[PDB]
Amino acid sequence: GLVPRGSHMSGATEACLPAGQRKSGMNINFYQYSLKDSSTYSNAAYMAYGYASKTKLGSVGGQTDISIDYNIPCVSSSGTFPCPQEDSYGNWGCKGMGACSNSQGIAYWSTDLFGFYTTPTNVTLEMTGYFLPPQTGSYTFSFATVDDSAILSVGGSIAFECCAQEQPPITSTNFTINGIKPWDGSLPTNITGTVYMYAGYYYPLKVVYSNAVSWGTLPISVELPDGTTVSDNFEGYVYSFDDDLSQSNCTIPDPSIH
Numbered sequence: 001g002l003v004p005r006g007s008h009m010s011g012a013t014e015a016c017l018p019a020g021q022r023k024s025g026m027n028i029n030f031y032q033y034s035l036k037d038s039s040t041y042s043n044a045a046y047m048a049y050g051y052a053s054k055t056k057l058g059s060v061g062g063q064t065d066i067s068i069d070y071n072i073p074c075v076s077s078s079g080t081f082p083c084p085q086e087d088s089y090g091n092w093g094c095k096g097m098g099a100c101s102n103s104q105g106i107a108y109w110s111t112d113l114f115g116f117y118t119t120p121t122n123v124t125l126e127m128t129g130y131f132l133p134p135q136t137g138s139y140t141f142s143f144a145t146v147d148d149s150a151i152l153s154v155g156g157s158i159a160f161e162c163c164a165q166e167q168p169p170i171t172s173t174n175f176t177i178n179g180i181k182p183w184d185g186s187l188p189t190n191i192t193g194t195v196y197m198y199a200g201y202y203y204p205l206k207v208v209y210s211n212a213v214s215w216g217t218l219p220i221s222v223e224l225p226d227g228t229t230v231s232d233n234f235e236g237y238v239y240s241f242d243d244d245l246s247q248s249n250c251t252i253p254d255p256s257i258h
């Protein structure tokens with residue numbers, strides 16, 4: 001046939017072709033989250049959009065290194081240094097530092113999350129941008145682990161609306177990765193998600209991440225159609241565009257036929 005038939009039952013992921021000035025990296029918005037609140041972030045509605053009802057603390061733009069690896073301080077005999085959680089022991093010390101005098105359960109202030117001065121012990125953040133596939137095919141996004149709660153969404157009308165990156169979050173709970181902290185205290189079951197993507201189209205991408213106490217961890221990767229994996233640093237893959245709600249042709253509902 002002269003043309004491709006298109007993905008079955010209109011199943012292709014919606015993408016965009018914003019015509020404005022492209023900027024490298026993703027925008028990160030920070031929102032209030034209560035220390036030791038282990039319930040709020042277990043709700044899908046909260047993780048999809050409810051987070052933005054809380055106080056907005058600030059933002060940073062142009063971020064290409066997007067994994068989270070926040071370690072709390074150990075106030076030790078030789079000074080105060082961050083402690084890798086796997087090196088924490090007893091009640092409590094940090095291997096190579098001796099006993100720590102400080103509490104694991106209070107808020108700590110730091111610029112570790114994207115250079116923004118906040119409380120990485122207790123915070124919710126929203127990463128937005130567009131993912132640009134260099135190759136046509138199946139992409140598998142992954143979280144290596146989640147502490148405390150997280151989602152990843154890809155696609156127009158799922159992550160956000162085309163050419164409307166800066167708008168209040170949309171209500172879709174159709175997550176690409178559901179890493180929401182289970183109520184049952186369990187581990188989130190599936191922390192990978194696959195999307196078929198067409199080279200050169202801009203795919204809206206949203207990551208919402210929350211921490212309630214102490215350590216925070218979110219190692220983000222993507223496996224490309226060629227089988228290679230990009231981890232942590234998504235430079236060359238992720239971009240931002242200022243809103244242009246007047247660009248009529250910005251949405252591509254079916255890139256499999258466009």
Ligand SMILES: OC[C@H]1O[C@@H](O)[C@H](O)[C@@H](O)[C@@H]1O
Pocket residue numbers: 065066067068069112113114115
């Ligand atoms: O914590 C999120 C990001 O913050 C940035 O300031 C760091 O340079 C990155 O290594 C990290 O992925």
Ligand SMILES: OC[C@H]1O[C@@H](O)[C@H](O)[C@@H](O)[C@@H]1O
Pocket residue numbers: 038085147148212213214215216
């Ligand atoms: O409530 C779960 C908590 O368990 C602790 O072992 C982790 O270190 C915290 O970072 C986590 O938030």
Ligand SMILES: [Ca+2]
Pocket residue numbers: 156157161
């Ligand atoms: Ca829509």
Ligand SMILES: [Ca+2]
Pocket residue numbers: 147148211212213214215216
């Ligand atoms: Ca934590």
Ligand SMILES: [Cl-]
Pocket residue numbers: 093094095096097098099
């Ligand atoms: Cl030690």
Ligand code: NA
Pocket residue numbers: 069070071084085215217
């Ligand atoms: Na860590």
Ligand code: NA
Pocket residue numbers: 072073074080081082
């Ligand atoms: Na520290």
